Amino acid sequence: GLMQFTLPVRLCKEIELFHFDIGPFENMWPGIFVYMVHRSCGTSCFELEKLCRFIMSVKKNYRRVPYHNWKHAVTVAHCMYAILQNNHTLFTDLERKGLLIACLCHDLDHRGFSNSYLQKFDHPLAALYSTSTMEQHHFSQTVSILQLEGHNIFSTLSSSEYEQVLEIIRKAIIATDLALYFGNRKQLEEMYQTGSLNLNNQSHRDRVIGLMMTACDLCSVTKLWPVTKLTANDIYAEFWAEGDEMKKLGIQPIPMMDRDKKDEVPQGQLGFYNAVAIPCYTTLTQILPPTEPLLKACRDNLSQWEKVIRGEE
Numbered sequence: 001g002l003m004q005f006t007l008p009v010r011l012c013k014e015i016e017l018f019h020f021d022i023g024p025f026e027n028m029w030p031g032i033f034v035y036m037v038h039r040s041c042g043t044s045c046f047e048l049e050k051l052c053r054f055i056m057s058v059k060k061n062y063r064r065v066p067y068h069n070w071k072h073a074v075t076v077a078h079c080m081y082a083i084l085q086n087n088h089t090l091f092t093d094l095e096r097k098g099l100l101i102a103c104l105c106h107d108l109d110h111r112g113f114s115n116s117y118l119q120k121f122d123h124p125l126a127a128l129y130s131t132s133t134m135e136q137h138h139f140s141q142t143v144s145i146l147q148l149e150g151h152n153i154f155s156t157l158s159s160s161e162y163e164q165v166l167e168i169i170r171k172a173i174i175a176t177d178l179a180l181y182f183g184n185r186k187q188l189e190e191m192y193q194t195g196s197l198n199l200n201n202q203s204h205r206d207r208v209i210g211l212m213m214t215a216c217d218l219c220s221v222t223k224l225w226p227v228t229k230l231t232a233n234d235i236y237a238e239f240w241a242e243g244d245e246m247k248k249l250g251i252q253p254i255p256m257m258d259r260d261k262k263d264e265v266p267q268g269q270l271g272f273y274n275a276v277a278i279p280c281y282t283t284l285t286q287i288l289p290p291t292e293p294l295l296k297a298c299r300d301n302l303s304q305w306e307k308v309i310r311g312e313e
């Protein structure tokens with residue numbers, strides 16, 4: 001009970017900042033997650049024995065892909081940690097518990113392929129789940145791990161608290177389907193400007209939690225340039241592999257996934273920052289002002305990609 005986790009001084013300070021990089025020492029990531037659960041939630045939220053067993057089961061069910069891997073999981077949970085800590089009083093005991101777990105689990109058993117690739121391949125998961133295919137899988141995998149003997153980190157919640165948290169986690173993981181983000185931010189944008197946004201409205205919280213999930217999921221764009229730059233290589237390594245597989249099915253992939261069109265990456269990063277990332281952190285900042293440094297970092301990186309096009313690097 002009195003057994004805290006503690007981090008070296010530099011990590012203890014930097015972990016509290018949005019732009020924190022969890023670093024290349026795999027073996028420290030579980031301890032970093034527990035540390036975040038303890039400060040964000042309390043040392044009582046979960047039985048340590050059970051949390052540690054759940055953490056390592058989740059780790060095992062992430063695969064060795066260039067980007068959608070265990071390191072992505074922990075990175076995306078740290079971003080949620082930073083948002084929750086800079087917005088102390090806006091979230092319930094249950095939401096702080098649920099959202100960190102949701103973020104750790106949100107890409108469980110990812111194979112590095114899009115929902116589109118699964119449908120064109122005619123993958124069995126595409127039959128089971130016609131929309132948000134991988135995301136429904138990720139929730140499925142999350143439930144499965146929660147039902148392993150000794151893995152129920154929520155066992156001390158009442159019957160209805162338990163159902164609320166699994167529902168928070170389900171909506172949270174579904175929301176990471178970027179196809180659903182555009183309409184979610186549009187609605188949040190309209191509600192904020194007409195002044196109808198009400199955080200006591202459960203359907204409104206759902207939407208705000210959803211946008212937080214998109215913000216955490218894309219957090220690689222909110223790091224220092226060298227982190228953002230080197231992650232982009234891992235993102236494209238999956239995309240070009242997926243394009244390779246599209247060609248094997250006799251389909252020309254979209255340019256994004258065509259390794260023949262590497263040259264156009266800087267332009268494609270601009271489209272993405274402008275079409276997705278900037279809108280996302282802007283609406284997030286409007287709703288939760290203390291999340292501004294994510295917008296500020298994203299804009300710096302937008303500017304870094306602009307400099308690459310102009311052959312300044």
Ligand SMILES: Cn1cc(-c2ccccc2)nc1COc1nc(N2CCOCC2)c2cc(Cl)ccc2n1
Nearest residue numbers: 217218219220221235255256261264265268269272
């Ligand atoms: C849109 N577009 C078009 C092109 C392109 C490139 C070359 C030729 C023609 C076109 N390059 C992009 C960028 O896509 C892209 N997608 C991301 N998501 C989407 C879903 O999977 C998770 C990651 C992403 C996530 C993060 Cl964190 C950071 C950067 C990202 N960049």
Ligand SMILES: [Mg+2]
Nearest residue numbers: 106107134176
């Ligand atoms: Mg995903």
Ligand SMILES: [Zn+2]
Nearest residue numbers: 106107176217
């Ligand atoms: Zn993800």
